[PDB]
Amino acid sequence: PVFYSSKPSGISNDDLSLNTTRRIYSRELYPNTDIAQGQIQVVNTLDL
Amino acid sequence: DIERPITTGVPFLLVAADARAAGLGDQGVATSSDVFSQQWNPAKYAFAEDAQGLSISYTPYLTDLANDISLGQVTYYNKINDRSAFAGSFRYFGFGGIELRQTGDPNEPTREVNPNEFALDGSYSLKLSETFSMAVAARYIRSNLKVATEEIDASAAGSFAVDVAGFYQSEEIAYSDFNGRWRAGFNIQNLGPKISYDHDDLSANFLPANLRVGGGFDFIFDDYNKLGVSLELTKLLVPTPPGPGTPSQSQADEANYKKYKDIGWVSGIFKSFGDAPGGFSEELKEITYSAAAEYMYQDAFAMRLGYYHESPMKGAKQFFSLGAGFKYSMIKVDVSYLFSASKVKNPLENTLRFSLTFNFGDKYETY
Amino acid sequence: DGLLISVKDKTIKVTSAKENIKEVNIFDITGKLIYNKKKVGNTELSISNLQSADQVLLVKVNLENNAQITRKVIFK
Amino acid sequence: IFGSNTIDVKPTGSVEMDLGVRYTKQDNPAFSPRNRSSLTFDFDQRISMSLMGKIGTRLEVNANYDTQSTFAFQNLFKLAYTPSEDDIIQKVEVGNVSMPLNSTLIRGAQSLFGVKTQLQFGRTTITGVFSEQKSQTKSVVAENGGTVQNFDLYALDYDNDRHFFLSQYFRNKYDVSLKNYPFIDSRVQITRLEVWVTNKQNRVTTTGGGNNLRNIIALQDLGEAQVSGVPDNEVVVISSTAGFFNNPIDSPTSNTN
Amino acid sequence: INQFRSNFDYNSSPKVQDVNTNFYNEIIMSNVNLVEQFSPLIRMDFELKSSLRVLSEIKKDRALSMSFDNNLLTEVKGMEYIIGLGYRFKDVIFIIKSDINIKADFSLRNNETLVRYLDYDNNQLAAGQNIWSLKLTADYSFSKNLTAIFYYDHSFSKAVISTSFPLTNIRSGFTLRYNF
Amino acid sequence: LTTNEYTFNPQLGYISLQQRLANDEILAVAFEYTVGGKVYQVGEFGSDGVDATVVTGNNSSNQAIITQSLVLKMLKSNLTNVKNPVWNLMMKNVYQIPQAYQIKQDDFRLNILYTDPSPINYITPVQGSSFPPNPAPDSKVEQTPLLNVFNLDRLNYNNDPQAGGDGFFDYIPGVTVDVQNGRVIFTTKEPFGELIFNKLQTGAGESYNDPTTYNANQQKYVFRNMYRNTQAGALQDSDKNKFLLRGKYKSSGSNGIPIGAFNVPQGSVVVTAAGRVLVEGIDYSVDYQLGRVQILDPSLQASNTPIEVSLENNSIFGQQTRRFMGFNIEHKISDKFVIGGTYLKMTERPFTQKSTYGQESVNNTIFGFNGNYSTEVPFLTRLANKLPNIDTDVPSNLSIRGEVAFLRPDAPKASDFQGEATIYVDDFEGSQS
Amino acid sequence: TVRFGALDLVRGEWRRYTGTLDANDQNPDDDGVEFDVAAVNIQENGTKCPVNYVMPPGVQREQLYNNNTVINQNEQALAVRIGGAGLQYQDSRAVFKNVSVDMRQYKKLKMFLHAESLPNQPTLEDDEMVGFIRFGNDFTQNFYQVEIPLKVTKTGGSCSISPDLVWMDDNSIDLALDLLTRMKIKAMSIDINSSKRDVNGIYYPDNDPDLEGGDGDGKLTLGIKGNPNFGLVRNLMVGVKSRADHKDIKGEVWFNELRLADLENKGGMAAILNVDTNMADFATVSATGRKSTIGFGSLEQGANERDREDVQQYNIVTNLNLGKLLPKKWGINLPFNYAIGEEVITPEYDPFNQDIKLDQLIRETTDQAEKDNIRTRAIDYTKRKSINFIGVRKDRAPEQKPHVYDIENFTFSQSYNQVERHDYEVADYEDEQSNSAVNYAYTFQPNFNYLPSNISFNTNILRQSNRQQFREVEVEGIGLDPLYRRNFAFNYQYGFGFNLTKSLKLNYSATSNNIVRNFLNDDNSPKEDFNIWDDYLDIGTPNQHAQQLVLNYDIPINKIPIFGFVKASYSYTADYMWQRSSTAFSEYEDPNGTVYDLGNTIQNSNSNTLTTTLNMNT
Ligand SMILES: CCCCCCCCCCC(CCCCCCCCCC)(CO[C@H]1O[C@@H](CO)[C@H](O[C@@H]2O[C@@H](CO)[C@H](O)[C@@H](O)[C@@H]2O)[C@@H](O)[C@@H]1O)CO[C@H]1O[C@@H](CO)[C@H](O[C@@H]2O[C@@H](CO)[C@H](O)[C@@H](O)[C@@H]2O)[C@@H](O)[C@H]1O
């Protein structure tokens, strides 16, 4: 999450929008799933 | 059932934190002035009878399952003059200390985490006229309800909100059988920028902006018996999420959700009035109501009945509430119980909310 | 007080020191019975079957001497 | 409406309120840099209040609120309005009310939270109640002292993966040696036994019966002799038994078999 | 000796040596434990006339265990330093005068487990623990019913083996108690 | 394993573990036993086995380490394989009695029944066939109790042999019962397999290991697949798991009846001996804090009559909210006649609109009319005064208490689907973990 | 780059049933039929390609409160996919589960079924694939089977299909259980070898040319094989069968919301009458009579917890103070207790078949002998009688000197309990128990002293007789042989304490338990015509004997004025126990024929203890 919240040096917003590096949210993959406010709202995918 | 509930962050700001108001069906915008009158209507803090007061309130969650999961509130008001008052409250919903263990060794340092959610607000209330007063409150809300794991960040999410309240209390007017008193109040709460739990500007949730309008009348008998009947109407100032579709199949839903989430809070407050296929007849459904009657004997015994009803299509939290209050010398003890009447399991069932307030300082006369 | 709860990875190991476990009930923060084992009679418990849509889940275990002890745990 | 104006409702006990900060830092290299340290605000309440009193010799108030125990049978709230004996209403009870019934077919509820009222018309007593029940029924059967527990197992419900024969010799002798029980037609007496399991605890301790960690190679056919009534391939897994055995067909299990 | 027993191989048979060419022993055992405990190694407890009391105690223990199944020496060492200070400031003025009771508890526990081979230097650090803690509390009675207790607990646990991580827990704040 | 982590039978040569091995865990043993004057060892012990490590050299630059391994006997393999004899080493004739720790004789009853569908304690031959003619006395099947069929009943109360048994389970603390663990062990390793196969066998052409050669009577009762396959694999043979071990055991521990609850409300305990309600002050005593019930009636203690104790425990969690309402009339006809009309209604609030089987909600109503009449009877006192050596003056009394109650049950409208009271056998929302 | 948004090993509660269901195939592990079981969710399968998953009409997502927020729970259905080569004409594939369901209180069994054709596969036609529910005790011998042809949802256009066209009411199963009961009654008269049975032995009323009305349901096809019971459903099964003669069908079927509806809410009645009278502190008579009808129960009892049986019970207890019939000059405590009672329980459902009402089965029998057998075997009759003479003793006089030979020190306790039972399991059950206890106790009040401080002695005669005869449920013609258990015992334990010296203290105790074996012949066979009062005062052969001896000695060594500081003290506990071996040991016979006596067992124990203070001062 450091790549998404606290923008590190050397990383631009273009590198964070490629569909292979962008953050995945639960509404994108599970639009019909209701998550309590304040809980995890992102899908922590396993990238190979 | 519930069709298209409003998805707003930090929902615990909309939960009653004091026993007195919770026994009145979660209404305090038009009731008599009290120390707990910060979450509901700070504008009547200038109408308080005592110089200053402090209060601690407790609301347990899942009483049958386990303790330490509760919402507490600490409020402190102080009026320097007869026209102005400074108040400050702190609400804290917490699951208690939770140990993290991944080993069975008795000698193993265990990390203790307390996923919590608190809101600290301070309000200034100024009595403009002899019977009318205004109040401005600033609130900081922090949420740390998640636990830090691998690939999961438990960084707390913070936000600010502004509350504008107004309270009117007419003088004691005599009638044929009693000398009652009229009260009215309005309060716009949670006006601030979106709170982002993921710390991303693209994924941000609206603050639970609320609008409460209430009015009440007090019948006074024998100079030592009071019966205050009050009614409050509550409406959220957040646009309704799109339902079936308001333009393939999932493309319309995705576009509608993207359009809904790409709305500023300033614009969203004005967009709250409408944004639905239904007209004013269906728009009236968005307003929940609460009707309460409080009986006061010798200003030391209080018996409160309340009925709070939300729409069946959103929220769907309809219940009755009983409450009792006792003042011995300077300490008021309030206990409230809730009888649910909705098809959904209310998490406040079988819960006896408690409140304990100490009032001290000089006494100010009430007009 | 005699019990050593532990959540290593998608499992909840329950060990009762010098006592016998009778029943273990696991609740989510909503109050739903995501797991129930009415009959164990063993010192060591290993659930390893929770779904845990949220992180904080409540477990309630009673021993052979009817000692209701509840300990909140975070699911890992 | 009330006998007097005196109110002696008195509180007792204690209340505590803790406000502070909790800072936790765990040096886990796998954690995110944003999870370097967690600084949170801690607020705790320890309400331990009781409240006993009367209001105008007509209201009796009894409350006990303590947030350190099960609220189902420890947090109590009782309001009792008792008018004069000449009034139609004899008792109004709010809170922890009870509904005792002097009947066997219709049992009442002892722990109820709600409204209970009592009216008396000359000689007819009407007791009404509307509440929530905080208890559950439980029925037990006791014969000659202690309770009786009934079990209904099935054949497939045996205790699996817990009981093991020490050898095929014992397995094939079990049925014959127990034909005339309680007499056991077997002179075998296990004098020493050591059991080794896969070590997933990976913990070293002196109080756990010593630290006896050894490399183990377990053979399936070790100590296996032939059986008169059982064919060889049901006793050993070795593909060819030519010269494998060097003892009589009914030799007891031993390393030299 | 938790479990010694007679050996059947120790008989009148001509076979006297085992596979390891060792003469059979009449009594055979698996583990032998030498436990030593200074509980405490020292305790200095002294109170001054200024209401200051100091209680310091050093405790130590060893749990040597020789196992003949693997011929390994498991040595568990433990050291514990405890310090406790109690002071009472007299006539502290906030119109409000009260005494301040200050209690400080410092602790330092070091535990270590080694597995030693006899034939060569293979001292294995099986487990370890190093936890120090400091708990300060200060009481102040504003009245007969209202009391305030300032608390500060600081516990740091270092890592001895890599399976555990250093853990710092710092709780601090105030506790207000009102009695009726 | 430590000595407290397992037990073993010195005579029958089997072991029982404190914790079962439901995973790929490997079990190895080394045991030495004595038969008369002979001593047999089957494994390698740490006392007589090879050294753990042998080191050659003085410094690590030229040191050679030889780590030697003990040779043991495998009881459980790393990879499960039912086709190997190591699978047969696991006992499948041991049954764990639920919540049993100290089961003892005179407080333990066990029976074997055949549910098809009702529980029947004997085996009938399949239609068109009959049991083998002229069976041995120990191999009786025709009209024979199942305890005698499975060799669990051949002794009297004092463990002495009897012709047809005493009809009760043979309690041997070393052969058939594990007292400290509350386990029941059959006298044969495959009681529901080879034993009943031999009981029903009609010739030498029928072999137990070849299920194609059965005689249409072994095709019904012989559960071979529960011994040649795992329990999950044996689930495929559903028409064989028809034998029910039904029994009871008495748990006392200490003096007093454990009602399984603490700090129960006063007056919430009702005790019934043989259909009559006992007196809370005369027939029994209740310690509410410890939840103990002590029977004070001298005749009832040594009576063997099953006593039903009902109580209301408030130490419940995760239960549906119960709304209890109703009224009770207490009209008084005369100074010695009371008529009551109690009416009550108890409703439950389900968590959701789908009530799964077992978690059912009730909407019950019960209304009853009762009459109490207590009168003084000087006639009985005067009659007793005519007895030889009785000259008392205490009044005699009579009391008639009648009560008629009607129960009308119903289900809450919350747990109703399409207007009907719905209970979901399986909504398929709990599957697929 | 491959980003797994989710990666799980998914396990199901419905097991893929391996093994053939039709006898025509006999080789299930062939035919290349890919049978898969999975789930379809509203949260994960809402955009499915053939048909987007939608809830059945009327089904709403469950709503809960997680933390001040309304959360809609997931709605899921069980998907069964048949592909590869396709099912044969009558071959079927099903998934099963082990449950325990009692559906006797509900009238309707309901379920939602959906059918669709696999993509890139030949289209499945209507009335070709059939959804069947098979429930009971097993899937091969005893089960109810309910089959329904499935209407295939049309695909090809938009993937989003309305719920009414997905979960069609034509494919929905709605079965009345009275149809199952009637089918079971009809199949009772159908022999297992009759031609009306299929190859698998399943009896379908719709395929019976001699039966009018079929199975009673025009949409569902009902079948029964081996007398199952829906009052206890141990096994449940849902699957797909085929109907296409010259085809191999492939498709996906969704099962959703298998439920029980139309609860039977008929009430019940109960009546209790109590007559309690006390007569001049001498007589106490308490008569209780209870009569409860079917369906009565408590408020909190569930659907299956209510009493499915008529109960008629009474109990009379009489307490008499017989000692008051004697003059009070010599007080006698002689209480007499006589407690009789009996209960008759008639079940709502016949114990045989466990799911047919007793009245319905009795009416639909047409056989007087069978009707009588069914009526008689259902009755559960119990009768208890208890006679008690516990506490028989003579009270001490107001001013009397205690003596060792005084009869007032004795106490007598007699108890007789008799239970007669007969129900569906036992045709006759007799349980007699007699306990006679005589207790004696005395405490003496004021070279070495030889007068004991106390004397303890008590004897116990405990006789128990159980006769248990199991019934033949088919006919009341012969029955099983009765089984006899007897526990005639004679237990006596005595003890005494001695205070030989001011320091010495010797407590001795000895218990002996003997077994009376007068009811056995020369061989190990009990005698049927034996009475429990035959020889009551009979001492049997010894069975167990325990002795305990505790000595305490303070060692008064202080008499010599050289060792006046020693405070020595010695304790010695000696225990002995002789245990008689079972007859299998004392009369063991080897296969060679020789009879060997293996002897009894003896145990001895010492507990020596020495404690010394040894004050070095003085
Ligand atoms: C953000 C909140 C800050 C915290 C505020 C604490 C205020 C403490 C003042 C104690 C108090 C308030 C009751 C509060 C109790 C709630 C405690 C909650 C516990 C939660 C678990 C109790 O006083 C009552 O209690 C009795 C105690 O038994 C007292 O008895 C006696 O008690 C002792 C003599 O008073 C004797 O020693 C004892 O012998 C007697 O018996 C009585 O005097 C009285 O009935 C009385 O208030 C009074 O004291 C002064 C002191 O300067 C306060 O000055 C204020 O300070 C700032 C205000 O902070 C303001 O800025 C400032 O303008 C203002 O000058 C005023 O308030 C004033 O009115």
Residues in Cβ contact with G576 at an 8 Å cutoff, skipping those fewer than 6 apart: G545, G546, G547, G548, G602, G603, G604, G605
The minimum CA-CA distance between C74 and chain B, rounded to whole Å, is: 7
CA F30/CA F28 separation, integer angstroms: 7
CA B269/CA B266 separation, integer angstroms: 6
Which residue type, as a one-letter code, is found at position D136? Q
Residue F254 tokens read as 């200490």
Can you spell out the DSSP letters for B215-281?
EEEEEEETTTEEEEEEEEEEEE-SPPPP-S-----HHHHHHHHHHHHS--HHHHHHHTS--SSS-HH
CA B355/CA D45 separation, integer angstroms: 12
Q: How many CA atoms lie within 13 A of F115 on its CB side?
A: 24
E strands of B103-147, at which residues? 111-113, 116-126, 132-144
Contact assignment for A40 to B205 by CB distance below 8 Å: no
Mutate to test the interface with A, among G41, G54, G66, G73 (most CBs of A within 10 A): G66
| Residue whose structure tokens are 């001062």 | G617
Nearest to G5 among A24, A34, A38 (CB): A24
Residues in Cβ contact with B332 at an 8 Å cutoff, skipping those fewer than 6 apart: B325, B326, B355, B356, B357, B359
Contact assignment for D146 to F267 by CB distance below 8 Å: no
Q: Is the peptide bond before E40 cis (omega within 30 degrees of 0)?
A: yes
Q: Cβ–Cβ contacts within 10 Å for residue B294, how many?
A: 23
Interface chains of chain B (3 or more CB pairs under 8 Å): A, C, D, E, F, G
**Which of B98, B86, B21 lies closest to B353, judged by CA?**
B21
G-chain CB neighbours of D129 within 8 Å are: none
Pocket of ligand 1 contains residue B76 by CB under 6 Å: yes
CA G237/CA D141 separation, integer angstroms: 37
Mutate to test the interface with F, among C34, C64, C72 (most CBs of F within 10 A): C64
Contact assignment for G582 to D183 by CB distance below 8 Å: yes
Please say whether the beta carbons of B306 and B24 come within 8 A: yes
**Interface contacts A/C by beta carbons within 8 Å:** 4
**Which of G109, G199, F127, G249 lies closest to G207, judged by CA?**
G199
A-chain CB neighbours of B143 within 8 Å are: 38
| Residue whose structure tokens are 């020595």 | G568
CA B20/CA B36 separation, integer angstroms: 8
Q: From chain C, which residues contact F within 8 Å (Cβ)?
A: 20, 22, 25, 27, 31-33, 39, 41-44, 49, 51, 60, 64, 66, 68
Please say whether the beta carbons of G58 and F414 come within 8 A: no
CA B53 to ligand 1 center in whole angstroms? 10
Q: Is G600 helix (H, G, I), strand (E, B) or coil?
A: coil
CA G50/CA E170 separation, integer angstroms: 58
Residue D141 tokens read as 């059967």
**Closest chain F residue to the Cα of E29, Cα to Cα:** F47
For the stretch C29-68, what's the b/e string if a residue is b when 16 or more beta carbons lie within 10 angstroms of its beta carbon?
A: bbbbebbebeebbbeebebeebebbbbbbbbbbbbeeeee
Please say whether the beta carbons of G577 and G546 come within 8 A: yes
Q: How many CA atoms lie within 13 A of E54 on its CB side?
A: 7
* Cα dihedral F278→F280→F285→F291 (10° resolution): 100
Residue B20 tokens read as 């007195």
Biggest alpha carbon–alpha carbon distance for chain G: 119
Q: Cβ–Cβ contacts within 10 Å for residue D231, how many?
A: 9
CA B19 to ligand 1 center in whole angstroms? 24
Please say whether the beta carbons of G228 and G142 come within 8 A: yes
DSSP G480: P
Method: cryo-EM
Pocket of ligand 1 contains residue E95 by CB under 6 Å: no
- Which run of H or E residues covers position G318? strand G309-321
Using the atom order of ligand 1, give the atom closest to the CA of residue E96. Answer: 37
Strand partners of residue D43: D19
Q: Is B84 exposed, middle or buried (0-12, 13-18, 19+ CB in 10 A)?
A: middle
CA D174/CA F190 separation, integer angstroms: 11
Pairing of strands A42-43, A24-25: antiparallel
**Which of B289, B302, B299, B291 lies closest to B216, judged by CA?**
B291
CA F195/CA F217 separation, integer angstroms: 13
Residues in Cβ contact with B264 at an 8 Å cutoff, skipping those fewer than 6 apart: none
Which residue type, as a one-letter code, is found at position G173? I
Please say whether the beta carbons of F112 and F152 come within 8 A: yes
Q: How many CA atoms lie within 13 A of B357 on its CB side?
A: 26
The minimum CA-CA distance between G581 and chain D, rounded to whole Å, is: 10
Pairing of strands D216-219, F70-76: parallel
Query: In terms of DSSP H, where are the helices of F35-98?
Result: 85-88
Q: How many residues does chain C have?
A: 76
Residue G384 tokens read as 């208890």
Nearest to G43 among A33, A37, A45 (CB): A33
Using the atom order of ligand 1, give the atom closest to the CA of residue D16. Answer: 21
**Which of F245, F361, F358, F320 lies closest to G102, judged by CA?**
F358
Q: Is B283 helix (H, G, I), strand (E, B) or coil?
A: helix
Cα distances from D34 to residues A46, B140, E169, F96, G579, in angstroms, run 19, 22, 18, 51, 74
Please say whether the beta carbons of E174 and E150 come within 8 A: yes
Phi, psi of B196 (to 5 degrees): -110, 110
**Which of G226, G217, G147, G151 lies closest to G178, judged by CA?**
G217
Pocket of ligand 1 contains residue D15 by CB under 6 Å: yes
Nearest to B146 among A4, A39, A44 (CB): A39
**Closest chain D residue to the Cα of G300, Cα to Cα:** D137
Query: In terms of DSSP H, where are the helices of chain C?
Result: none
**Which of B67, B100, B94 lies closest to E169, judged by CA?**
B100
- Which run of H or E residues covers position B75? strand B70-78
CA G398 remoteness from chain centre: 55
Residue F314 tokens read as 């408030």
Question: Resolution of the experimental model in angstroms, please?
Answer: 3.2
Pocket of ligand 1 contains residue B361 by CB under 6 Å: yes
Which residue type, as a one-letter code, is found at position D46? R
Three-state SS for chain E is CCCEEECCCCCCCCCCECCCCCECCCEEECEEEEEEEEEEEEEEEEECCCCCEEEEEEEEEEEEEEECCCCEEEEEEEEEEEEEEEEEEEEEECCCEEEEEEEEEEEEEEEEEEEEECCCCCCEEEEEEEEEEEEEEEEEECCCCEEEEEEEEEEEEECCCCCCCCEEEEEEEEEEEEEC
Which residue type, as a one-letter code, is found at position E17? Q
Contact assignment for D43 to B74 by CB distance below 8 Å: yes
Strand partners of residue B229: B217, B293
Cα distances from E106 to residues B183, D24, E166, in angstroms, run 59, 19, 19
Residue G535 tokens read as 């020889």
Please say whether the beta carbons of G72 and G62 come within 8 A: yes
Mutate to test the interface with D, among G234, G298, G590 (most CBs of D within 10 A): G298
CA G140/CA G202 separation, integer angstroms: 10
Is the CB of residue F28 less than 8 Å away from at least one CB of chain E?
Answer: no
Which residue type, as a one-letter code, is found at position C66? N
F-chain CB neighbours of E7 within 8 Å are: 47-48
> Which residue's CA is the nearest one to ligand 1's atom 46?
B360
Residues in Cβ contact with G166 at an 8 Å cutoff, skipping those fewer than 6 apart: G51, G54, G56, G114, G153
Contact assignment for A24 to G72 by CB distance below 8 Å: no
> Which residue's CA is the nearest one to ligand 1's atom 29?
E143
B-chain CB neighbours of G160 within 8 Å are: 249
CA G274/CA G296 separation, integer angstroms: 19
Q: How many CA atoms lie within 13 A of B298 on its CB side?
A: 17
Strand partners of residue E93: E97
Please say whether the beta carbons of F297 and F303 come within 8 A: no
DSSP G185: H
The minimum CA-CA distance between G151 and chain A, rounded to whole Å, is: 28
Phi, psi of E21 (to 5 degrees): 60, 30
The minimum CA-CA distance between A29 and chain B, rounded to whole Å, is: 11
D-chain CB neighbours of F223 within 8 Å are: 155-156
CA G380/CA G382 separation, integer angstroms: 7
Strand partners of residue E46: E54
Q: How many CA atoms lie within 13 A of F390 on its CB side?
A: 21
CA G72/CA F359 separation, integer angstroms: 20
CA D27/CA D36 separation, integer angstroms: 7
| Residue whose structure tokens are 């399943």 | G202
> Which residue's CA is the nearest one to ligand 1's atom 6?
B54
| CA angle, residues B272, B274, B276, in degrees to nearest 5 | 115
Residue G89 tokens read as 């004409």
Strand partners of residue D41: D21
**Closest chain C residue to the Cα of F183, Cα to Cα:** C41
Strand partners of residue G442: G455
Mutate to test the interface with G, among F297, F346, F431 (most CBs of G within 10 A): F431
- Which run of H or E residues covers position C27? strand C21-28
Is the CB of residue A36 less than 8 Å away from at least one CB of chain C?
Answer: yes
Is the CB of residue F261 less than 8 Å away from at least one CB of chain C?
Answer: yes
Residues G186, G192, G194, G199, CA torsion sign: positive
**Which of D247, D257, D163, D174 lies closest to D219, judged by CA?**
D257
CA G451/CA B294 separation, integer angstroms: 84
CA B206/CA E92 separation, integer angstroms: 50
Residues F115, F118, F123, F127, CA torsion sign: negative
Which residue type, as a one-letter code, is found at position B245? G
Residue G359 tokens read as 């009245």
Contact assignment for D182 to F159 by CB distance below 8 Å: yes
CA B334/CA B295 separation, integer angstroms: 14
Residues in Cβ contact with G316 at an 8 Å cutoff, skipping those fewer than 6 apart: G285, G286, G287, G288, G339, G340, G341
Phi, psi of F324 (to 5 degrees): -115, 120
- Which run of H or E residues covers position G490? strand G489-498
Pocket of ligand 1 contains residue E145 by CB under 6 Å: yes
| Residue whose structure tokens are 């109050």 | C31
Mutate to test the interface with C, among A33, A35, A39, A42 (most CBs of C within 10 A): A39
Q: How many CA atoms lie within 13 A of G536 on its CB side?
A: 12
Residues B174, B175, B180, B182, CA torsion sign: negative
CA F211/CA F225 separation, integer angstroms: 10
Pairing of strands C69-74, C56-63: antiparallel
Cα distances from G326 to residues F387, F409, G281, G398, in angstroms, run 10, 57, 14, 17
List, as ranges, residues 102-141 from B with C-beta within 8 Å of D.
Answer: 105, 111-114, 116, 118
CA F395 to ligand 1 center in whole angstroms? 68
Using the atom order of ligand 1, give the atom closest to the CA of residue B360. Answer: 69
CA G46/CA A33 separation, integer angstroms: 11
Can you spell out the DSSP letters for G428-455?
EEEEEEEEEEEEEEEE---------SEE
Helix, strand, coil % (nearest 5) of chain B? 10, 45, 45
For the stretch B88-125, what's the b/e string if a residue is b when 16 or more beta carbons lie within 10 angstroms of its beta carbon?
A: ebbbbbbbbebebbebbbeeebebebbbbbbbbbbbbb
CA C58/CA G78 separation, integer angstroms: 30
* Cα dihedral G588→G589→G595→G599 (10° resolution): -10
CA B18 to ligand 1 center in whole angstroms? 22
